[model samples]
Target: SAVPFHGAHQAGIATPVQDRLHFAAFDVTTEDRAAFVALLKEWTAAARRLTAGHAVGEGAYGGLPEAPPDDTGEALGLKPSRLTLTIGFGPSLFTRFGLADLRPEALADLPKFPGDNLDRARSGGDLCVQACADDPQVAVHAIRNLARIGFGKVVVRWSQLGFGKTSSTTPDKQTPRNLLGFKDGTRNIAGTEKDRLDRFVWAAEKDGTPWMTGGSYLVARRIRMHIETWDRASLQEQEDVFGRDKGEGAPVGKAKERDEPFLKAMKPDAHVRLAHPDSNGGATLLRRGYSFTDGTDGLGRLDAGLFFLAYQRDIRTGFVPVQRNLATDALNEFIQHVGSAVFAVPPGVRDADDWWGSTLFG
Candidate 1:
């Protein structure tokens, strides 16, 4: 029952990672720019109410006889569960809506990286909605209702359900392990680090886009893990691949997880070392990634891995460089970049007088 939707920045971005995630990418189906902007306004209102644990119009069971219930009633009588809904705009949206000039330069689509097997069906969208909650039902309900509201105006391009959080964005939250059984994102920049958030997370006036001055950019990846291959590897080989101890998640030759990683001691092609900020000119990132398991493929392989989410002031300097360094990483053999997307996440809505993307819409 926490996390107010309105703030200086978005709630989901820096709030402690929730236990479950329901992330969706949507493509705008209508060509009316006004209609699309209106959807965002309506979404802002709906998100505000949903985040506070309330139904949209009538509480679950009560709506006009001629109209459907405002909420689906699945989460009726339920607590907030710390639900948070974060919205983002994709590159394609600017093509319509006369927003080409307004789209921030930093909102460019990601460059293809080495070893990518990206799927076109799940790759990009005109909009995105990220819902996180302690309860899976709460998360799902949020997306469902929002999707319902969009109706013919927008269509879901793809969606993902995530169970475990892969990293912490807050100082108090504990780091979580990825499917690789390694405590990943251990060196993530905390959401509470104001200086770092300003320096690396939030876009500034100097970014050349006044409409997105306080906003950020999101880079999303659907990485598929080769569970069969990884399960057959020896513990030592696995540890060597990650350059960290399996149990304590400490860097090799280090005593604890908190110890500064001795990057020099790591094997060449080690994931952590190659993706480390030190290896990329202190280019840190605000990672809010999650682990996903979407059943098995027809080949009897698990179709899952990390839903890698990173918000940065400028992705060119944040995820781009880090991913470039990992293009040839040893971990590449165990994972495939099957889905990718990039979106322009606007700043948080203020009070009742405001709405999401109001700066651009107004």
Candidate 2:
């Protein structure tokens, strides 16, 4: 099914005020997985009861469980949705922090990695509410209430993680934008038979962990997207920095989107330095990101950034290396990573009705 975007600011459901809220990542237990699903259904019902409106948006990954054939038929599996909730708040309910406190800015200004980007400023603030239940419906209620009450803005999305089969090495299809914003992954892996043989290790392949086999696929990223400063550069300058046009997404130093070379695409002294092959030694990571815009604030205008996400078999090889290179990247001047979180998503329990975290802690 299609992905859903929920919250007050999404689509046209606007609120009178903007309230700050916190972001969190959570993993559910195996035994509680079914309960969580039930809770979500109940919560959704309750929300519909409280408010005349339906959810702003909603989405799910994988399909729902199937019933057994016979009286003693095997149990159906659990599908855990990666739910995202956004809430708005008033200024009184929110507390803000300076750019120096956020992880990205803190790391960027360090002397060991001293650079010109330090002079740039960044900052952010958020509101937070405890998630009472793992149910999607319940989340919808919470999100709707926050919006109705004027919580800033929130959005949620879900994915299956392909039962751990989806890895950084798991091959991906191309997006309109790749590393350099060209049509990336033209030859990348998909679920095709020709690429299936590349599976080196799967949950099923490992002994003593059959339950978790084909389960969770670890994802991590330290993405740095240029925000304010990127807009200031001239068109040619921007093209040189990103190796692609911000308007039409055409490649620089090359004719075809796929044909552009890393070096030729970059300005010799532009802030797009982090993506440079020379500075980063050709280290690459698969990226799947979402753009976020949260209106304007007094310091500048509204805050806009990328939801930097990536998947890999090993965190070190996949995300860490690329992040290290970005420590001193030209992009650092504009973007500030104001928030971060990590989660251990459990595998899908196709049968026997297990919870998300049941296998790990048990």
Candidate 3:
């Protein structure tokens, strides 16, 4: 089934998490504001059709004999697979279009955290597209078509394909496990919880950017897990790091996954205790992470980890403090953040005639 393409907020953020993700960051090559706007319009039109299970402009076959087809045709026979295409603007994008004054206060470049070994190649972008779907090909096709539409206007900076979601917005469903063999996001915000969404997830005009009212900020981090090292740790040692049991996914000294956690029961440096909202002055984030396997490192260890995607109303209150608190977390010993980027995700496209980024551009 296809996710609705139009809404008050973007689909991928609060919509029930998809199984696969094809996320891409693009760098704009054109200085002409009109040309970039036109590209955005074209990309939005393609995104609308693609998410609705229709091919781009013209299908691979039966088009002009001499000209290339618009749609790539790989996903022609497939279902929509609940595909969602979400767009965001990076801090650097504002400098190009005379929009520096319009950048949101929360959209500033993320500060370098304590243990981040960031890679410049995968770090920043002028814009980003988060394409998610149940079928990997459908998600990939959406990004491929958008890139084709971009052509000379923009070039892909970096992209990541992720499988096996690590977090979920739909809490009633079974919680998914991460590459570390632990059920992650046991206390994630739910899509059905509207009150929490307004307070924690959706941005407001009072947040210092009027164009970002219904929008949200995204913090993407490519965290690499040292699985070989974690695998050798004792079962009790593993439990101590996360403060949760591996079998039931329950909190320390708890019987069930949903049981309220007593933060005092866990060790001071335990991940759950450090990352909890209480530990960060009531700050909360909507996490939608995915596990990725990008082959192996030269040293014969698997270079796999969680591509952590988090959305929140403000960076100051949401991710910044929480991540800082996690600097002392025991889990940090086995994981390292390798790639990072942040974007100001604008509100959703209103209708067929409306386009992405129209609020800011208008």
Question: Going through the candidates in order, what is the number of backbone clashes in each?
Answer: 0, 34, 0
Model 3 residue 231 lDDT? 99
Clashes of 2: 34
Which numbered prediction scores highest in lDDT against the true structure?
3
Flag the better candidate by lDDT, 1 or 2.
Answer: 1
Clashing pairs in 1: none
| C-alpha lDDT of residue 169 in model 1 | 49
Q: Kindly report which residue stretches of model 3 are placed more than 4 angstroms away from their true locations once superposed.
A: 165-172
> Taking the tens digit of each residue's C-alpha lDDT, what string does model 3 give over 208-238?
8889989999999999999999999999999
Ranking by lDDT: 3, 1, 2
How close is every model to the real structure, measured as TM-score? 0.96, 0.47, 0.97
Predicted candidate 2 versus true structure: per-residue lDDT over 1-362, tens digit per residue: 11122221110011111111123222222234344345333433433322222332231223334622111111112111223332211121112222122111101111223232321112111222222222334433444443332312222222111011122343333243432233433222232322221231122324233333443222322233455566676666656555555544445555554554555446654434454335655444333333445556676654554545433223344345556666555555656554432322233323323322333334
Model 3 RMSD in angstroms: 2.0
In model 1, which runs have C-alpha deviations exceeding 4 angstroms? 165-173
> Total clashes, candidate 1?
0
lDDT of each: 0.88, 0.33, 0.91
Query: By summed lDDT, which 10 consecutive residues of candidate 2 come out lowest?
Result: 9-18
